[PDB]
Write a protein that binds this ligand. Structure first.
Ligand SMILES: CCCCCCCCCCCCCCCC(=O)O[C@H](COC(=O)CCCCCCCC[C@H](C)CCCCCCCC)COP(=O)(O)O
Ligand SMILES: CCCCCCCCCCCCCCCC(=O)O[C@H](COC(=O)CCCCCCCC[C@H](C)CCCCCCCC)COP(=O)(O)O
Ligand SMILES: C=C/C(C)=C/[C@@]1(C)SC(=O)C(CC)=C1O
Ligand SMILES: C=C/C(C)=C/[C@@]1(C)SC(=O)C(CC)=C1O
Ligand SMILES: [K+]
Ligand SMILES: [K+]
Lengths: 414, 414
């Protein structure tokens, strides 16, 4: 059976990354910030918080708002996720050296949680006020959830497929999994992949808050997200979008690109347990990890590092600790970046895959913030207090989503 | 290089199909109907048409509304596409003999155009009227576009992955493409796949009609949808959802299921041309067809039948005829089912895949309705007037979507 290690699949490398976060618009500054123990979570100053007296009054807005880079027409012709996709798509390509690739071998796979939903409600209000001729001729193509991926495909010229897998909070990792599949199956040699997501707003907070699993530690925003900690009280929103460029090792060599890491395998499963709670036993989630190992050609003892989904929900963290044990990876050093960056939903799995890549490139895992009281039921090696340094050779990035979706990505040091 | 024909991919068979359409809730009755020249397209009698004086006053509502089957609890706690998913998934599973499969080898892949969007505008109105605590605690899990796929995965017990590819009008076929990939790569032995979509409503009609591509032949509804006809004047909505059950031929034989057809190969590409117009040259669209043949182990000369996306827009049908030529498939017999069933957006490529399968099972292509004046730019063998019987062995189903997505599926007689 084919694996990366046994040459049954071609070698695929990560050759550029871009991300915008609550800490910085520059991924390399976000990364230094994380290492120095910086949090992007703050008191929400938005008017909408006082207008509605929201129970949740914390979150990380992007340091550098997407729309400060958007012109007059982009504001009127794209939904917010498409605007983010355009912004990141251009930054990534510039970071890659603006390569001239064969368009017929270039694919885009970009996940998102929802799509251009603000244009749904705008279109609804416009029609209710002034009838059907007040709806934009662009409303369909701004709203459709494949919109951000399609904007990036058009921007960069991708003709080997533009795909948008949606799996709620695992969408941004799932996208990279499908990009890797498309290359190893011979449909593409190069792919831009990742995840984008909307900003923090009143209605999203209201709707997630009614499920009662958001932190309300409003007095102390930077202490509120505590994945794996005994005193965790739910997740915190933190805005992000992130993309990476992956290509065959041969394609990278031929153009002189310097790889940051290798993308070795990907595992996708599903729980069939509950729509909005993960299976407590972590068995299908652990199988996604295992399947990424099988495809990579690795054993669980090879894994130095797991980048946890680690939302800081009580039931979420417990299930993931069980999954990591089921996969044999519970001696890896674990990071839960939502501790500092919060949860960006459809993008978050892409951001964390980027962080996994930087961990491998630089030999360092940032501290998990707020990890102050270990939880007996979670017996994991959670990195905390200061960075953990090592010559890491292999890591797995985990992401999970409402629906019972489990995605695991195996990366290696280049 | 592995193909189905050369045994490099495992054999994959279609063992059950279900669909609900404008003609019938029973796919076998829908099929008999199409063969008898029936149309599902009628005057819209909804009060919203006259309320808003909509330019488009025609379309095909389901013969049998999904909600005639829906418990009162479901009507509050699932979105419309989730209800459609649950209904179709239970029907499919019964049609299959309710098999006991290994859940850890069973995947679901179901596309849709948008998701539970009615719950977005419901949540918005509730919050505006009553504040943030009047939003449903189930709002998120009803809205998320992976919701329908996830309902089906929970309902049927799928633990090998639940996926929702979103590619607007090609989603339904793209879902079946990714299910075939998942089986041939060894991630699953059996999969439920296809597409669901919302109903014709006021805001959907306004937003699409403002793009200026819909038919407004309101005085003759059954004559409005005219794919490939010289006098075509745009597309017509017709509601549907459809699912099929695919599995390895070995798995089928083990349980004694008689196949309906073989699913031989799939190709996905993208245009990088325009967000809402297909590339005129048909080149990337023809490459998707060619890719499906390469993976099948077929040559264009083998192909007997093409089930065309055939929307009846002037530019869309012209581009598809060029793509069929690019692919070398322009000697095949062509059917354009939107002539009879109209356009079901995210569900349509799955519906048309099911029709392709029945064509191969029964050796007959239904007539393309309203095909009265050949267009010299098309120069295709369009089946029309009466059904055409023949010994069809191989067929390609086309679907394309806003964003420039091209999906082709290669099917074969069992
Ligand atoms: C990290 C946060 C993650 C967020 C959660 C993800 C949810 C998806 C986010 C959707 C995209 C939102 C885009 C907002 C653009 C923007 O900002 O529009 C403001 C003005 O507000 C609005 O129009 C708010 C309109 C909201 C649109 C409907 C959202 C409905 C959300 C659902 C009820 C709950 C969330 C469902 C998530 C399902 C999928 C993931 C599991 C500019 O203001 P002005 O400049 O005009 O003054
Ligand atoms: C032939 C298929 C047509 C496909 C069209 C696809 C459009 C997308 C699918 C939308 C799914 C909506 C489900 C409808 C539920 C239903 O019916 O609720 C009515 C009462 O009205 C409503 O609340 C309708 C309000 C709809 C609000 C959101 C619609 C947003 C539409 C966008 C602005 C334009 C379409 C975007 C498509 C992008 C994706 C594909 C390219 C019954 O009322 P009651 O009898 O129960 O009292
Ligand atoms: C099946 C449900 C799952 C996986 C739920 C998780 C663990 S995933 C996620 O991001 C969150 C917080 C938003 C959960 O509560
Ligand atoms: C890129 C745009 C494309 C492929 C557009 C097509 C041809 S596909 C489709 O179903 C329709 C009618 C709604 C189109 O107008
Ligand atoms: K992670
Ligand atoms: K078709």
């Amino acid at each position: 059976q084919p694996s990366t290690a046994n040459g049954g699949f071609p070698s695929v490398v990560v050759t550029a990354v871009t991300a915008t976060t609550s800490i910085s618009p520059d991924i390399e500054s976000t990364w230094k910030g994380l290492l120095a123990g910086e949090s992007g979570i703050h008191a929400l100053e938005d008017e909408f918080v006082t207008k509605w007296d929201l129970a949740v009054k914390i979150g990380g807005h992007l340091k550098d708002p997407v729309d400060s880079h958007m012109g007059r027409l982009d504001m009127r012709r794209m939904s917010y996720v498409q605007r983010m996709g355009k912004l990141l798509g251009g930054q990534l390509w510039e970071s890659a050296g603006s390569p001239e690739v064969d368009p017929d071998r270039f694919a885009v796979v970009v996940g998102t949680g929802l799509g251009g939903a603000e244009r749904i409600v705008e279109s609804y209000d416009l029609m209710n006020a002034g009838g059907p001729r007040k709806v934009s001729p662009l409303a369909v193509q701004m709203i459709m959830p494949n919109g951000a991926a399609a904007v990036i495909g058009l921007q960069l010229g991708a003709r080997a497929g533009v795909m948008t897998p949606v799996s709620a909070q695992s969408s941004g990792s799932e996208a990279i999994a499908h990009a890797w599949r498309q290359i190893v199956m011979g449909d593409a040699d190069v792919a831009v992949c990742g995840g984008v997501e909307g900003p923090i707003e009143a209605l999203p907070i209201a709707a997630f808050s009614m499920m009662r699993a958001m932190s309300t530690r409003n007095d102390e925003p930077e202490r509120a997200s505590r994945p794996f900690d005994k005193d965790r009280d739910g997740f915190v929103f933190g805005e992000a979008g992130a993309l990476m460029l992956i290509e065959t090792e041969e394609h990278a060599k031929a153009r002189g690109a310097k790889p940051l890491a290798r993308l070795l395998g990907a595992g996708i499963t599903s729980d069939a347990f509950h729509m909005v709670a993960p299976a407590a036993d972590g068995v299908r989630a652990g199988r996604a990890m295992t399947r990424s190992l099988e495809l990579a050609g690795l054993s669980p003892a090879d894994i130095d590092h797991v980048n946890a989904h680690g939302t800081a929900t009580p039931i979420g963290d417990a299930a993931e600790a069980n999954a990591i044990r089921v996969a044999g990876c519970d001696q890896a050093a674990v990071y839960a970046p939502k501790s500092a960056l919060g949860h960006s939903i459809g993008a978050v799995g892409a951001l964390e895959s980027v962080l996994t890549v930087l961990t491998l490139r630089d030999g360092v895992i940032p501290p998990t913030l707020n990890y102050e009281t270990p939880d007996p039921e979670i017996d994991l090696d959670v990195v905390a207090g200061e960075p953990r340094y090592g010559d890491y050779r292999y890591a797995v990035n985990n992401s999970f989503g409402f629906g019972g979706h489990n995605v695991a990505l195996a990366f290696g040091r280049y």
